[PDB]
Each structure stands twice: as structure tokens, then as C-alpha cells.
């Protein structure tokens, strides 16, 4: 009747997750009473410490654990393989493999288990995915107009624009408040990276794609890659980038944002930044000083292999199983994907359409999808398909929107025909890669921002990839080759 979840939450939503709408109807329909360990900040170095100090729940939901950490708690019997579960207990989540089979590939290890149940969320295909680009560029049109400046079609076009942005007081307060060049550095959707493919390649957060030759680049190494720090230099150098870039976060970026100070900054939805106006629009592909014209392709997509993993100290698996398996149902997965309806208290993202027994979006009317979104939903293993919209759900329409975005402006210069697949690798080499990546990534971004700050990029440019040599590059690269091989061979 009772079962123990550690999960993750957003901080805008209830320390207790009881308070959601979706988990009260839950309760009242699974006769389940979930009490939880709600992690609203540092949801993995918690669980790290709950792990470590032997203090299990019953099962880790809305989990996010890398296939190391999988395999590990898996060596050691922290949490449980769970096909057979599947196979008896879980007929939502089978018809689901059984119409796309594909996915349960992804979900067994090599050691024929499964671990994790997964999140599934169809929205595009290949290079016309929602995934493909994370951290799209955006513009100001506003002080284009205002200044009277054409949209930028190449570098040189867009360090002009900038400087007009810098000088040129667009806002009309008198005052040089414009910030021509925002970003949030590191992983993620602010990132500014995805113009390093204005040099050719560029980057992604894995720093990883896939050659046209069959062979994959870690693009961090590359003189294109150079090419893109020496770009942001130039915009540093002349005073173009936020004062703020590398110390600011997310919530001081929307603050920013929502005073309409940037002339171009990057994330996932406008929305989310400076509002639902007119003033920003996407900053179309730019050409590089030798006709370099690239966007590459991130390696996301719709599935994440592990949103709930069950623990070796839970004592109903079948509960918990048939638990589980109701967040597969189509009308519950898209609500703890998404939201609900019918909160007389609150804004709601959906209305329910009785007639039908179905899921309507209704307009945010101004109010940042991601807000109201972080308030109500409640992640965890979930599937959408994209045989539900027209049927379950209607298309989001920030979701149509950016796949009609991705369509218009990217997908023509994804020249990539592959990026890297979703592989399982063994243990041993999950141990290797966490190695070498326990160095490189952050000695990666480290170098990077110093480069901008400083401008001694071209004198240390051999040192750092000597460096990433003795970090295990050349190892690392030889077993993404492998996986990609084993991949494309079947
Ligand atoms: O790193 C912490 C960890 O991140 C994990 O997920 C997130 C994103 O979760 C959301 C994602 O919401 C969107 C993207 O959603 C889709 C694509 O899946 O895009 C459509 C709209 O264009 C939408 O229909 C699709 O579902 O991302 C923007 C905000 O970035 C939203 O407007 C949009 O819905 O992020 C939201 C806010 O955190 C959360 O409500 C959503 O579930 O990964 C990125 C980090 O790289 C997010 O920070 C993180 O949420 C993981 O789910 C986990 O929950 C933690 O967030
Ligand atoms: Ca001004
Ligand atoms: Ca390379």
C-alpha cells in the first residue's frame, strides 16, 4: 500500500511532490501511497550520498544515472535487473515494445538486463528531431530594425551588428545597458557553441560527431575548433560579451532577458528568455569567413535510458512493477511528461477533453512554457509515441513550433548524414571512459573560457592537445570508433 521513491524535482514545483495534481488523482487511481525523498538541487550528489550511506527507497525515480553509475549499482546488487517484471507485470510498457521493438534495445545491457525504465518521447526523426540543435541562437529583430541593420548573413556581418548593439543605444534609455553577446558557457541549451560550426565541424556537449568518412572527430581538437574560440576572443576583446558570462545562472539570464537587454543569446525557446514578442527571432546559419556553412548535430534524441531504477532493497516488485507500468499508460505518460488539467488554482497546460477522453494544449498566454511546466509535471519513466498526437495529445505547440524552426533553417546544413548512435558499452569500457572524461571535460571548458579571457589560445593551442594526449584521447577516440562500428555493422 506504501512504497519509499527518492526523486527529482524542479524547485519551483512542492518540496512534497504529494502537492502535484497529477500525483493526487495517482494516488486516488493506483491506491498507491508514494512517500518521497523530493531532491529539488543536487539530485545526483544526494542520491550519491543516500547510496553510499547504505540509505535505499525502494526505487529511484525520476532518476538520471549514466550507464556507469548503471553498471555499477548493477555489479554490486544496489538495484535489480527488471525484464522479468516487464514480462509479468508491465502490459502498458510491453505493447510499447512491441509496436517500436527498437526501444528495447536500448533499454538491455549488454549483459542481456535491463536496469532502467526509460523515458520515450517522439518528436522528429534523424536530422529533423527537436534534439538536433539544443542551444539555437537567437536576435534582437527590434534593434535591427531600430538601427536600421540588415540580419547578418556571415561573422564578419554579425561582430558589425554586435558593435551597433554595443554603441548604438537601440533601447533609447541613454545608456550603454545593451548586451550585444549573452551566454551561459558549458553544457546545455545557453551554451554559445553551436557557431564554432561557422568554421566548419564545430561542436557539441560530447564533443563528439560522426565524419562523413564512417569516422567520428572529437571536435574539441580541431583547428576549426580554434577558429571558433579566436572568433569569441574577438568578441571579448571588443567588449561585445556580457560582463556576467561566466558567472552568471540561469535565473539571472531571465532576468536579463525579460528587460530585453541581449542583442543575441542562446538557449532552447526564446519564450523561456525574453518572452513570447516579436522582438527576437532565430538568428539564421551564418556563413564563416571561407563560406564554412554547418550546423552540427548534437547526439540527443528522444529517449533517456534510466528515469527510474528499482532498488535492491524493495520488497513488492510487483506493486511496484504495476506501479510503473501506470505511468506508461498514453493518458498518464503525457501528463507527467507535460502537465494536466483542471487546477482551479493554478495555470493549467492541458484541458481535458471528455468527449473524446483526450489532452488538449491550451494557449500559456505569455506565461515561459518551461515555468509552468517545471510547476506540474512529474518526469519520471514515461512514453510518448508519435502515433498519440491527433489521438491522446495534441502536438505541444512549442514543440510544433521549433520542429517547423528545425525544418526551416538547420536541417539544410546538417551535412553530417550520421551522429553518434546510443550504445550500451560493456562495463570495462564504461570504467575507461569515465577515467579519461573525469580529466578531459571540465580541462575542456577550463582552457576554453581562459582562451576568451585571456588570448594566448594560438600559443597554447599544441600544449593543450598534448594534454588531452596524456588525458587518453587517442584511447577514448579508439572506443567511441569501436561501439560506432559494432553500431553500423549490426
Ligand atoms: O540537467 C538537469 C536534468 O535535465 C533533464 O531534463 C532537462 C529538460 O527538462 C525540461 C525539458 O523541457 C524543454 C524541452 O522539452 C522538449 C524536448 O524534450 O522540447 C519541446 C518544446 O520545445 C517539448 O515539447 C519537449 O518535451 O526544454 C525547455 C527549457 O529548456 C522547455 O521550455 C521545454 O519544455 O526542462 C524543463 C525545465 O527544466 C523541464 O520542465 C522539462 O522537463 O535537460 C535540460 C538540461 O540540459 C533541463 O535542464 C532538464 O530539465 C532531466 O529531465 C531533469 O529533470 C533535470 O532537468
Ligand atoms: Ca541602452
Ligand atoms: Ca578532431
Redesign the pocket.
Known amino acids: 500500500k506504501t512504497l519509499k521513491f527518492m526523486t ?3 524547485p519551483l514545483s512542492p518540496k512534497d511532490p504529494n502537492e502535484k495534481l497529477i500525483l493526487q488523482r495517482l494516488e486516488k487511481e493506483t491506491g498507491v501511497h508514494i512517500d518521497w525523498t523530493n531532491y529539488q538541487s543536487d ?1 545526483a550528489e544526494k542520491r550519491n550520498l543516500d547510496i553510499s550511506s547504505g540509505d535505499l527507497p525502494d526505487a529511484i525515480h ?1 532518476d ?1 544515472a549514466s550507464d556507469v553509475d548503471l553498471m555499477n549499482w548493477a555489479k554490486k546488487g544496489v538495484i535489480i535487473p527488471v525484464e522479468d517484471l516487464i514480462d509479468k507485470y508491465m502490459p502498458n510498457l510491453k505493447k510499447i515494445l512491441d509496436e517500436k521493438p527498437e526501444y528495447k534495445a536500448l533499454m538491455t545491457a549488454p549483459d542481456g538486463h535491463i536496469y532502467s525504465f526509460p ?1 520515450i ?1 517522439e ?1 522528429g526523426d534523424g536530422k529533423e528531431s ?2 538536433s540543435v ?1 542551444d539555437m541562437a537567437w536576435i534582437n529583430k527590434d534593434w535591427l530594425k531600430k538601427l536600421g541593420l540588415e540580419m547578418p548573413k556571415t561573422t564578419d556581418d554579425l561582430i558589425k551588428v554586435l558593435e551597433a548593439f554595443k554603441n548604438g543605444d537601440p533601447n533609447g534609455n541613454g545608456e550603454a545597458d545593451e548586451i550585444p553577446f549573452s551566454f551561459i558557457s558549458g ?3 545557453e551554451d554559445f557553441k553551436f557557431l564554432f560550426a561557422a568554421f566548419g565541424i564545430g561542436d557539441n556537449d560530447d564533443h563528439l560527431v560522426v565524419g562523413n568518412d564512417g569516422k567520428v572527430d572529437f571536435t574539441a581538437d580541431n583547428d576549426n575548433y580554434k577558429e571558433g574560440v579566436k572568433f569569441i576572443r574577438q568578441l571579448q576583446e571588443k567588449g561585445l560579451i556580457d560582463k556576467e558570462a561566466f558567472e552568471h545562472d540561469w535565473n539571472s539570464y531571465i532576468a536579463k532577458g525579460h528587460d530585453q537587454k541581449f542583442g543575441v543569446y542562446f ?3 526564446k ?2 528568455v525574453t518572452g513570447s514578442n516579436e522582438s527576437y527571432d532565430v538568428l539564421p546559419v551564418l556563413a564563416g569567413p571561407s563560406g564554412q556553412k554547418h550546423v552540427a548535430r548534437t547526439n540527443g534524441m ?1 529517449f ?1 535510458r534510466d ?1 527510474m531504477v528499482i532498488t535492491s532493497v524493495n520488497k513488492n516488485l510487483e506493486l511496484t512493477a504495476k506501479w510503473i507500468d501506470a505511468q506508461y499508460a498514453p493518458l498518464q505518460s503525457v501528463q507527467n ?2 502537465g494536466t488539467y483542471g487546477d482551479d488554482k493554478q495555470q493549467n497546460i492541458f484541458e481535458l477533453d471528455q468527449a473524446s477522453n483526450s489532452l488538449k494544449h491550451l494557449p500559456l498566454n505569455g506565461t ?3 515555468e509552468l ?2 510547476k506540474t ?1 512529474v ?1 519520471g519513466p514515461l512514453a510518448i509515441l508519435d502515433s498519440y498526437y491527433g489521438k491522446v495529445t495534441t502536438m ?1 505547440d ?2 510544433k ?2 520542429l517547423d524552426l528545425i525544418k526551416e533553417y538547420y536541417v539544410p546544413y546538417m551535412s553530417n548524414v550520421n551522429n553518434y548512435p546510443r550504445v550500451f558499452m560493456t562495463q570495462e569500457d564504461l570504467d575507461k571512459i569515465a577515467h579519461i572524461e573525469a580529466d578531459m571535460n571540465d580541462y575542456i571548458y577550463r582552457k576554453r573560457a581562459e582562451w576568451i579571457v585571456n588570448g594566448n589560445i594560438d600559443t597554447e593551442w599544441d600544449d593543450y592537445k598534448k594534454e588531452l594526449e596524456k588525458y587518453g584521447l587517442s584511447d577514448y577516440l579508439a572506443i567511441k570508433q569501436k561501439y560506432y562500428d559494432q553500431y553500423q555493422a549490426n
Open positions: 527529482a524535482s524542479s539530485f525520476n538520471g523515458w518521447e518528436l527537436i534534439h539544443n553544457n546545455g541549451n538557449t532552447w525557446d519564450n523561456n528522444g533517456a528515469k511528461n507535460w515561459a512554457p518551461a511546466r517545471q509535471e518526469g505541444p512549442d514543440a513550433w521549433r
